[PDB]
Design a protein around this nucleic acid. Structure first.
Lengths: 431, 42
RNA sequence: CAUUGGUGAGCAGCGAAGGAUUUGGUGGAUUACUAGCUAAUAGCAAUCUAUUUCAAAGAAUUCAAACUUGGGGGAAUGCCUUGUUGAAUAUUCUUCAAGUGUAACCUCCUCUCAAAUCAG
């Protein structure tokens, strides 16, 4: 290397350790509300008293911020600077700071949060010392001028490099910069490391989470052509979707649902991956408000695919999980909706899974098959398995009404597959 | 610590992990994908 | 009219799932390749530390020692040299002069040009 770059690297090693007093009046004078002439003349104790003055109201809003009064907002936690500590102590400092950041990420519209984190900016240089968590916890607030102030103060990491033109700017950072920020690959590995961190800690609130799905979804919007870049984009999004569905949270569930919907509708995965998606979706479909979304997810999911075995029957674990988390009459209500969304490739696949494992509710299938105008090969492919359940399952009046409906609608289709399999008069010899 | 020895929630992750190409290129789907023509000048 | 000027439209023409440009970073060569480190015949390379230390070997210009200084002056005050004086015990030191003596120390030079502008 050069000497000058090898020495400007030591600026990055000691960007916060103020040695000359002008370095102090640079390093203390930037904070989240106060102008740098009044921010220059602030004693540490005076800022900590305002810190507790916002922190007590925050802890009274929810008690989880009370523990940072024990450690971070302690009255003993003023004089200690970071650079005086060992890195093993600095790691625990960063742990406290990070867990505080995703916590306060919800409460950030409050001026209590702005007055609380400004001291942490000023006591622990978290605009510089830990700026990846500062930005990742507070990324969704890109319209708010509190964040826009925060942009003029953060030493920008290479991972957040779209905003290199937006630090110390007037107008707020635009919506397209969020996509171009997220359109990088390793940025998405940071956003997994944020959201997965929020999942185990269960600090996942709705507005930021809607911003997550709107950014990830717009990423696959931007990668509609770059199918090889999309094929390295499946590992980052489907991991976030899977680890999202392990949440108790229902907004996180519909978030992972939107991820799977827009991902399958933008890029056709293999069928077995969609079966994995169905297992992870249905295996945590518990609360009510996610069911209406999650049904439409599989409605999209089975429509996103095409191949050999396009509408084949589901596995018995998958089908019994589906018929545990939904009833029959759930889908019997849903297909009679006036929205009536096109789950055409799902029904003709799921009725076969009824027709092999269960076989007990084919009056239900009659109700099902009168509801939806299906596809041409689909009805034929249902009728072949119903020929199979004519032959091997003992013939019953439910199947008689089934095939009488199938003579009422597309008798000749039945005649063609019967000329393919079996005979015509032998099907009259069925019942 | 990490050892292998109703539906499970690891079910997406495992089937991702045993895949590298997630596009079903082994399909021969007999439908045409949009926007990208496998076309060769002869 | 030549435009032999480009813009600008275009077209013939070239033409395989783009073409054209501009740049960041890094690697490879830019002499003809025998491995890294150390206390080195050996040990290391996860280590030389509670054998690294004893031992031997190891001391002249009797004080040769600016090969190095822009050039002139001088060189007061310093130094050098001998001349010369005292003291101590054959030698240092006190005292003193003579030196077109002197890389200390004082000044003069080592700037003013058919370069240009400008009145006449």
């Amino acid at each position: 290397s050069s000497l000058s770059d090898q020495l400007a690297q030591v600026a990055s090693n000691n960007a916060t350790v103020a040695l000359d007093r002008k370095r102090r009046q640079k390093l203390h004078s930037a904070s989240l509300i106060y102008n740098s002439k009044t921010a220059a003349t602030q004693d540490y104790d005076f800022i900590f008293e305002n810190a507790s003055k916002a922190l007590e109201e925050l802890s009274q809003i929810e008690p989880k911020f009370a523990i940072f009064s024990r450690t971070l907002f302690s009255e003993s936690s003023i004089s200690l600077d970071r650079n005086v500590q060992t890195k093993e102590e600095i790691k625990d400092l960063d742990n406290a700071i990070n867990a505080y950041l995703l916590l306060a990420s919800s409460k950030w519209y409050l001026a209590p949060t702005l007055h609380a984190t400004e001291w942490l900016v000023r006591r622990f240089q978290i605009h510089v010392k830990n700026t990846e968590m500062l930005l990742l916890s507070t990324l969704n607030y890109y319209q708010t001028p509190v964040f826009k102030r925060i942009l003029s103060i953060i030493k920008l990491p290479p991972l957040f490099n779209c905003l290199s033109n937006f630090v110390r700017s007037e107008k707020p950072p635009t919506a397209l910069t969020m996509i171009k920020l997220f359109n990088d690959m390793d940025f998405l590995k940071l956003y997994t490391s944020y959201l997965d961190q929020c999942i185990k800690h269960n600090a996942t609130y709705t507005n930021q989470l809607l911003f997550t799905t709107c950014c990830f979804i717009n990423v696959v919007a931007f990668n509609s052509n770059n199918d090889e870049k999309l094929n390295q984009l499946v590992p980052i999004l489907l991991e976030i979707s899977a680890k999202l569905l392990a949440s108790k949270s229902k907004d996180c569930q519909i978030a992972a649902h939107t991820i799977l919907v827009v991902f399958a509708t933008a890029l056709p995965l293999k069928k077995t991956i969609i079966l994995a998606a169905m297992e992870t979706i249905l295996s945590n479909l518990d609360a009510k408000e996610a069911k209406h979304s999650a049904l439409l997810t599989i409605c999209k999911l089975f429509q996103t695919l095409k191949g050999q075995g396009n509408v084949d029957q589901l596995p018995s674990k998958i089908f019994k999980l589906f018929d545990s988390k939904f009833d029959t009459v759930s889908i019997l209500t849903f297909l009679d909706k006036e929205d009536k969304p096109v789950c055409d490739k799902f029904i003709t696949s799921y009725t076969r899974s009824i027709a092999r494992y269960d076989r007990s509710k084919l009056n239900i299938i009659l109700s099902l098959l009168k509801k939806i105008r299906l596809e041409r090969y689909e009805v034929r492919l249902i009728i072949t398995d119903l020929i199979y359940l004519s032959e091997i399952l003992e013939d019953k009046s439910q199947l008689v009404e089934l095939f009488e409906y199938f003579i009422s609608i597309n008798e000749d289709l039945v005649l063609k597959c019967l000329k393919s399999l079996g005979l015509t008069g032998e099907l009259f010899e069925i019942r | 610590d990490e050892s292998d020895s109703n539906g499970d929630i690891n079910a997406l992750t495992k089937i991702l992990s045993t895949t590298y190409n997630y596009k079903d290129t082994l399909s021969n789907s007999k439908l045409l994908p949009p926007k990208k023509l496998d076309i060769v000048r002869l």
